[PDB]
Amino acid sequence: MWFEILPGIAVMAACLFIPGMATAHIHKFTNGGKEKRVAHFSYQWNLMERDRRISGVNRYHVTKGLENID
Amino acid sequence: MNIMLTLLTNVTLASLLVLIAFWLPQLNAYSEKTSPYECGFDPMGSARLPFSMKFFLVAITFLLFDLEIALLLPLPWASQTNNLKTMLTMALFLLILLAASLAYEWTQKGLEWAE
Amino acid sequence: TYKFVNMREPSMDMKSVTDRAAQTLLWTELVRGLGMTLSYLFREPATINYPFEKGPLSPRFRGEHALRRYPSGEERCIACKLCEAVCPAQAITIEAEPRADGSRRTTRYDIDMTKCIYCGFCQEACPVDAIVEGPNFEFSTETHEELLYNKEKLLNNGDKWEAEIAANIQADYLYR
Amino acid sequence: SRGEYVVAKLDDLVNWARRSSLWPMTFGLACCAVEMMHMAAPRYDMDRFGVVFRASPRQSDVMIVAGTLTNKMAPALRKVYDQMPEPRYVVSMGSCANGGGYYHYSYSVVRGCDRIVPVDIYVPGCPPTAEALLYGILQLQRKIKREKRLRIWYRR
Amino acid sequence: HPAAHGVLRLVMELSGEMVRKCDPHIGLLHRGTEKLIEYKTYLQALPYFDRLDYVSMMCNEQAYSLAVEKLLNIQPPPRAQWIRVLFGEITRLLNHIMAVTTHALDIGAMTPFFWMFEEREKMFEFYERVSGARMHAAYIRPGGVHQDLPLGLLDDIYEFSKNFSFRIDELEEMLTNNRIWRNRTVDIGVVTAEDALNYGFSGVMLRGSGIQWDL
Amino acid sequence: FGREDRFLNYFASMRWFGGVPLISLGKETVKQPVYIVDVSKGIINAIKDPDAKGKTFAFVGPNRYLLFDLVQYIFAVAYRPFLPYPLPHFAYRWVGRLFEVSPFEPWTTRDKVERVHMSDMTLPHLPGLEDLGIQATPLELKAIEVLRRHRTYRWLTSEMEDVKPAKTVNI
Amino acid sequence: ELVQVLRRGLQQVSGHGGLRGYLRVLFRANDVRVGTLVGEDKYGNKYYEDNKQFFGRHRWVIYTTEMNGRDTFWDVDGSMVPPEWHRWLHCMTDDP
Amino acid sequence: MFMINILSLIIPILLAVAFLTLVERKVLGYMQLRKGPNVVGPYGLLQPIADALKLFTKEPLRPATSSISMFIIAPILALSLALTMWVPLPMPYPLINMNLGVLFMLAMSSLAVYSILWSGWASNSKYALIGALRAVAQTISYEVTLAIILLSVLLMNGSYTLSTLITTQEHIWMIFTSWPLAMMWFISTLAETNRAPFDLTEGESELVSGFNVEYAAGPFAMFFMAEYANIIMMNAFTAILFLGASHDPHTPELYTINFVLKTLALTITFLWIRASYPRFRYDQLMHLLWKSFLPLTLALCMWHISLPIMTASIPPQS
Ligand SMILES: CCCCCCCCCCCCCCCCC[C@@H](O)O[C@H](CO[C@H](O)CCCCCCCCCCCCCCC)COP(=O)(O)OCC[N+](C)(C)C
Numbered sequence A: 001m002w003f004e005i006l007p008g009i010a011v012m013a014a015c016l017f018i019p020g021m022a023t024a025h026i027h028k029f030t031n032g033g034k035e036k037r038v039a040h041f042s043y044q045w046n047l048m049e050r051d052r053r054i055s056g057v058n059r060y061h062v063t064k065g066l067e068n069i070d
Numbered sequence B: 001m002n003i004m005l006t007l008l009t010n011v012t013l014a015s016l017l018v019l020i021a022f023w024l025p026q027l028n029a030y031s032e033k034t035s036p037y038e039c040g041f042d043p044m045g046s047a048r049l050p051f052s053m054k055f056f057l058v059a060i061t062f063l064l065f066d067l068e069i070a071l072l073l074p075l076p077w078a079s080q081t082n083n084l085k086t087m088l089t090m091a092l093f094l095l096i097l098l099a100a101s102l103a104y105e106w107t108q109k110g111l112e113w114a115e
Numbered sequence C: 001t002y003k004f005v006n007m008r009e010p011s012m013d014m015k016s017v018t019d020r021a022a023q024t025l026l027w028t029e030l031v032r033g034l035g036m037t038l039s040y041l042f043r044e045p046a047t048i049n050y051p052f053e054k055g056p057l058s059p060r061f062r063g064e065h066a067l068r069r070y071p072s073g074e075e076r077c078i079a080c081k082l083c084e085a086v087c088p089a090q091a092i093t094i095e096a097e098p099r100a101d102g103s104r105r106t107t108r109y110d111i112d113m114t115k116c117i118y119c120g121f122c123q124e125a126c127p128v129d130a131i132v133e134g135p136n137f138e139f140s141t142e143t144h145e146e147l148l149y150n151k152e153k154l155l156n157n158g159d160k161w162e163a164e165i166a167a168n169i170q171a172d173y174l175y176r
Numbered sequence D: 001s002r003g004e005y006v007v008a009k010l011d012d013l014v015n016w017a018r019r020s021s022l023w024p025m026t027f028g029l030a031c032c033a034v035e036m037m038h039m040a041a042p043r044y045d046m047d048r049f050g051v052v053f054r055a056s057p058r059q060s061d062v063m064i065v066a067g068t069l070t071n072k073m074a075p076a077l078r079k080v081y082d083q084m085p086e087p088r089y090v091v092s093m094g095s096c097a098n099g100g101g102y103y104h105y106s107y108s109v110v111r112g113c114d115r116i117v118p119v120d121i122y123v124p125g126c127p128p129t130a131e132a133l134l135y136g137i138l139q140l141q142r143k144i145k146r147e148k149r150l151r152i153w154y155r156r
Numbered sequence E: 001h002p003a004a005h006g007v008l009r010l011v012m013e014l015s016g017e018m019v020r021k022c023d024p025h026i027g028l029l030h031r032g033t034e035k036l037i038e039y040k041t042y043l044q045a046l047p048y049f050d051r052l053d054y055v056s057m058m059c060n061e062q063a064y065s066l067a068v069e070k071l072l073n074i075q076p077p078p079r080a081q082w083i084r085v086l087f088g089e090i091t092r093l094l095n096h097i098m099a100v101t102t103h104a105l106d107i108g109a110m111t112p113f114f115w116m117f118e119e120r121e122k123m124f125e126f127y128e129r130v131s132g133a134r135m136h137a138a139y140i141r142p143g144g145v146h147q148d149l150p151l152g153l154l155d156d157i158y159e160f161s162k163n164f165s166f167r168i169d170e171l172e173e174m175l176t177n178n179r180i181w182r183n184r185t186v187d188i189g190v191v192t193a194e195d196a197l198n199y200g201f202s203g204v205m206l207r208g209s210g211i212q213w214d215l
Numbered sequence F: 001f002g003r004e005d006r007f008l009n010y011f012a013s014m015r016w017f018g019g020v021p022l023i024s025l026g027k028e029t030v031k032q033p034v035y036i037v038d039v040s041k042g043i044i045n046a047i048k049d050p051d052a053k054g055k056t057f058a059f060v061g062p063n064r065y066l067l068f069d070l071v072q073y074i075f076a077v078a079y080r081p082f083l084p085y086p087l088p089h090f091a092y093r094w095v096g097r098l099f100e101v102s103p104f105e106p107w108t109t110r111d112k113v114e115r116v117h118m119s120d121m122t123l124p125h126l127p128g129l130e131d132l133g134i135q136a137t138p139l140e141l142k143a144i145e146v147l148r149r150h151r152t153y154r155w156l157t158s159e160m161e162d163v164k165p166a167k168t169v170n171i
Numbered sequence G: 001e002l003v004q005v006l007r008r009g010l011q012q013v014s015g016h017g018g019l020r021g022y023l024r025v026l027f028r029a030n031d032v033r034v035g036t037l038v039g040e041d042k043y044g045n046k047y048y049e050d051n052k053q054f055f056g057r058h059r060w061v062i063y064t065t066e067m068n069g070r071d072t073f074w075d076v077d078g079s080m081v082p083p084e085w086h087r088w089l090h091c092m093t094d095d096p
Numbered sequence H: 001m002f003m004i005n006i007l008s009l010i011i012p013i014l015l016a017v018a019f020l021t022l023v024e025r026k027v028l029g030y031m032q033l034r035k036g037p038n039v040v041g042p043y044g045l046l047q048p049i050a051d052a053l054k055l056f057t058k059e060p061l062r063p064a065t066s067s068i069s070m071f072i073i074a075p076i077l078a079l080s081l082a083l084t085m086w087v088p089l090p091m092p093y094p095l096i097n098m099n100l101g102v103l104f105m106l107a108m109s110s111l112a113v114y115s116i117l118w119s120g121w122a123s124n125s126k127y128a129l130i131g132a133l134r135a136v137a138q139t140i141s142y143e144v145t146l147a148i149i150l151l152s153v154l155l156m157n158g159s160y161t162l163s164t165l166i167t168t169q170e171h172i173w174m175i176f177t178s179w180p181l182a183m184m185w186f187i188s189t190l191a192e193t194n195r196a197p198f199d200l201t202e203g204e205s206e207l208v209s210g211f212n213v214e215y216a217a218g219p220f221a222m223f224f225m226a227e228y229a230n231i232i233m234m235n236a237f238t239a240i241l242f243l244g245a246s247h248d249p250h251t252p253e254l255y256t257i258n259f260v261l262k263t264l265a266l267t268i269t270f271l272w273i274r275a276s277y278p279r280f281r282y283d284q285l286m287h288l289l290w291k292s293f294l295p296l297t298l299a300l301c302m303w304h305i306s307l308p309i310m311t312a313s314i315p316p317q318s
């Protein structure tokens, strides 16, 4: 044997592992490494648009702190 | 945009697989190979003849019951109202009406298939 | 003497009624069947590793035919045609004449193996143990004509399989 | 030549794929189908070789004629052989399917299924053992391993 | 067809999936055995009965041998008759395994088939050891039997018999109390005793209706 | 012409492009097709005839057809719409050359186009099928057995005597 | 006792002469069991037995890679066994 | 970079389906006292590759009586829909983040039946038509109960977003709050995927090959792939719905491993169920779904509407 079914199960598990970590890593890579923003409502979209406008490089994930307030 | 892209990608993958299936292998088609299958003997009639449905009443009842699904789906949002008593009364009223309709169809032998 | 197979009556008390309700609502016997399949999953299978392992056989096994010889090298067959007369499928053809030394020998001994039913009647009828069914069973061919044996092929089969045919006959001839 | 090497390797790949995935039709006639079942039984487990029965002729690669073919049955056998998409193979199992057998001289029996369809492998016996049928199937696999379609196409 | 049990052309008239008429067309395995028997001696005709019912072989041999013995006015020795009954019961085991497992396979349960075809293999081994053929033995003959049993056969038969009950129990656990199996089998194919008698039924097809009969 | 021929099947398969290109609308070609079974029987009879040792035979059909009418009849038996249009010789040669580059069996070739649009010679001085005891089978009696495979489901059951045989340029 | 079966697998690997022989027998015969050598043919076939297995798996043969004229590294069949070892291997006798 | 994500979502699923074929064969074999594929490739690991290569090099058949357009459309639609119904699943991050992901799954799953319908009808054969009619009956049997079970379960989630199911089950699995609904949902998912004991559209012993009897080679392979992809996808949906894994924003790999393990367990349970039981009659499935599941589902819908209001446990995100 019953343990010779295990290789196929392991191959299936390895194949099914790929989508989740692929999505996680691609989200991190394209969003500054910080967990791509979620906008279910218009308020969050407005926050994202304000961030993009004040970024100066037209990317929302570029975050400005107190050093931009002088 | 993204959903349109993924729909196009999936449909293109399926179509490409069909094209591979139909253009790669060697084809030898003759009349006997493409005849309909009926366990080795020729069919008596046509497959386009009427085929009786013994569960037509259940089909119409499913048509009617499918719209109560649309009526009941906004319940997670309706639960957030301030006047919860009216909302609960109306949800229970709708579900009781649906259950009574099911009971009426059941007791008059509406769920039994035609023989 | 007889017995009934489905003539029993269920108990009507509250305990058994609740037990049957719980069985209906919680799928007890279905779980039992799942458990039986699970137990079978953990047993050793009965499969053998063919062709490296073979299924058991016995000395009586009736396989491919062969014609035999005496220890001196002379053929055992004397063209009596008893096997031909007894063959239930008419799968044997025999022609004979006196040999150059006056012996009684066949000039044609053919067995159609697509007519044969492998009953073993020929080797029961033979009085000199000339024709036998050997132990071989892996002699599938690619053409129909390769299964129409003549005297040369049968004598070759005897010469090829005698080492096992004699041993199998030795282990069983006391049952005959 | 590079092209000969490429076509040889592709032919090997296609032959391996074909012989390692043989799906016979769920088809039996007489006593020999019982030995076919015992071939499918756990002791021999033909599925372990990649051999799976499939009911539809459109999803089958091999036809095993297991039993006597009568005159009444011959058109149906030919019809279900014709509906198999190619490539397709036929295995003749037992004396009745090979040459008529015990019923060779009868008025209602076809003297061998090779009068109706071409046959790749003849398995002798009445009935052949499940081991003998397995030997025939493996011989058919070896025969499929020997075919040269792409090489002959290239030599044209 | 997988569920046609061989060569059967059931022409069926249906309204939807309801069966209005069944017309079984047979003769796709008619090989003219009786005329062929007319062209053979009594000994030469015995192997045909092996191939009549290729699941109950020694039983057909036994029936033919009993008929020939009655016509010949001879009596087999007691040991031959005991061997005949023993192998008839083994053959009954084989036949009932085939029947139940393939009926379940037609219904949709495939596992018991594989569970019991190993027992079928062991019984085939018994057949081959006694006769040299796994299924077409021609062992039972009008004089009795062809050969005596090999010196170590009864021990192996006892070994098989002392364990077959657990296999029957596992099959019963798989099927008997399953509610799906009951829904597929209960009240299906009901036949009355009078109709069974008038239609020429025999065997279990009588005993299932309550008729107390057994040859 | 026959079930596995490249004559009737070739013209029937032209439906896939939508129109049938015919040099000069096929009005300057004459064809005399012959059945396959007649050819095979004639070969057998030539083998079994002792007088045919050094002879030369011409196996031709009982009717001569213009190419346009032959293709029209082929399309009528197959119940496919017929849309013939005239294509010049050099354009057709170009198309054939384009198709010739197929490493598999080419759909058409320049040689095939040349042979399709050439009339069949008449050789009355040579013996034919009727000198070997064979009566030539007309195409109108055997065209359905080749062309029923090219029909759609709506027309699969149409009988042989439905499609009104074509006109022959005989004598 | 999981460790015991793991060590049994390790000795199964080692008993085939290392990883090379282990893989050769795994890809040639689809079986890595280790038995007692009963004998060797003049054609090269080796015969192994293991009475701890159930009836049917207690005897087996590893076919030679080269018989009379053909390469049998991959192409093997049951007709390759000579008659004496044929009688032994099919359990028609108890004596090799 | 989004196309890379689509490819890395869709190719591994096809590989998993290919090897699920082998896993099913081996599990059934070992449950039946045999081995299953162990010859081609070590432990039969190359069996799916041989099966696919054989199928796609074999001749596909165009039935003379068939309707070619729908005959070719149906497997394309089946495979495309099976691939599409994977995009909103959070693992723990969805490829496409939807406000109403559950409704999207409902709609596309109800659209997937038309592949079987149109393939069976366009085959123009009797067994295919019987299979298609059985598909109609099966959908009518299960759809309403499926939808009501889903709504009753999501009444505790607060929304139709699939990601919120992660935060809802942070401390306890939803199996411990709605196990009767979960049992009914599991049976409904078995019926939705035409799996034993509800594999009536195929009906191997009854209808030869059922709705795909006329299909051969690659078009048949596509139907097989869609079937098994639907199996895996439905079990993943069940695992996300009732066995909620814990997610740490800084290590989503742990969530992915746990969720894949639960999905694999559910799929193996599917194969176990197939190996253990006989087949229903297709009217008995309708009676089971309409006379036993529906009243209980209505009562539990009432209960799950009343419970959060009774206990002041109403979820957020109006
Ligand atoms: C990229 C997507 C499209 C293409 C998909 C390709 C899939 C990958 C290919 C899979 C390769 C596996 C095949 C090789 C395994 C066979 C193992 C070995 O046994 O084969 C032997 C030799 O193998 C064959 O001779 C040749 C097989 C492969 C031939 C060359 C490989 C070509 C690969 C090129 C890839 C390009 C794909 C197409 C690109 C468009 C013959 O032995 P066999 O009879 O079995 O076993 C006997 C049984 N016993 C052992 C129990 C006694």
Ligand SMILES: CCCCCCCC/C=C\CCCCCCCC(=O)O[C@H](COC(=O)CCCCCCC/C=C/CCCCCCCC)COP(=O)(O)OCCN
Pocket: C024, C025, C026, C027, C030, E179, H180, H182, H183, H184, H186, H187, H197, H238, H242, H273, H288, H292, H293, H296, H303
């Ligand atoms: C304090 C307030 C609480 C309020 C009360 C809440 C408690 C509720 C108590 C009752 C709950 C019972 C729920 C059960 C769901 C209905 C099941 C049922 O009763 O149906 C069965 C039938 O259901 C089945 O048998 C299903 C058949 C399909 C079998 C498929 C495989 C079996 C399942 C294996 C285990 C699955 C595990 C489920 C969970 C998986 C994880 C998600 C009845 O049918 P019959 O016996 O034929 O009789 C009907 C005529 N009288």
Ligand SMILES: COC1=C(OC)C(=O)C(CC=C(C)C)=C(C)C1=O
Pocket: D025, D026, D027, D028, D029, D030, D031, D033, D034, D036, D037, D067, E002, E004, E005, E006, E007, E055, E098, E102
């Ligand atoms: C024992 O009775 C028989 C059957 O029932 C199990 C069969 O299915 C079949 C044929 C069907 C399969 C494919 C062997 C035959 C020939 C038969 O004799």
Ligand code: SF4
Pocket: C083, C086, C087, C088, C089, C090, C091, C092, C111, C115, C116, C117, C118, C119, C120, C121, C122, C123
């Ligand atoms: S075994 Fe029987 S059928 Fe075969 S040749 Fe001998 S007597 Fe004839």
Ligand code: SF4
Pocket: C076, C077, C078, C079, C080, C081, C082, C083, C084, C094, C125, C126, C127, C128, C129, C130, C131
């Ligand atoms: S083989 Fe035996 S029975 Fe047959 S002719 Fe020769 S001696 Fe007589």
Ligand code: SF4
Pocket: D030, D031, D032, D066, D067, D068, D093, D094, D095, D096, D097, D101, D102, D125, D126, D127, D128, E051, E054, E136
């Ligand atoms: S060869 Fe023998 S066992 Fe096989 S079908 Fe014919 S009579 Fe029956």
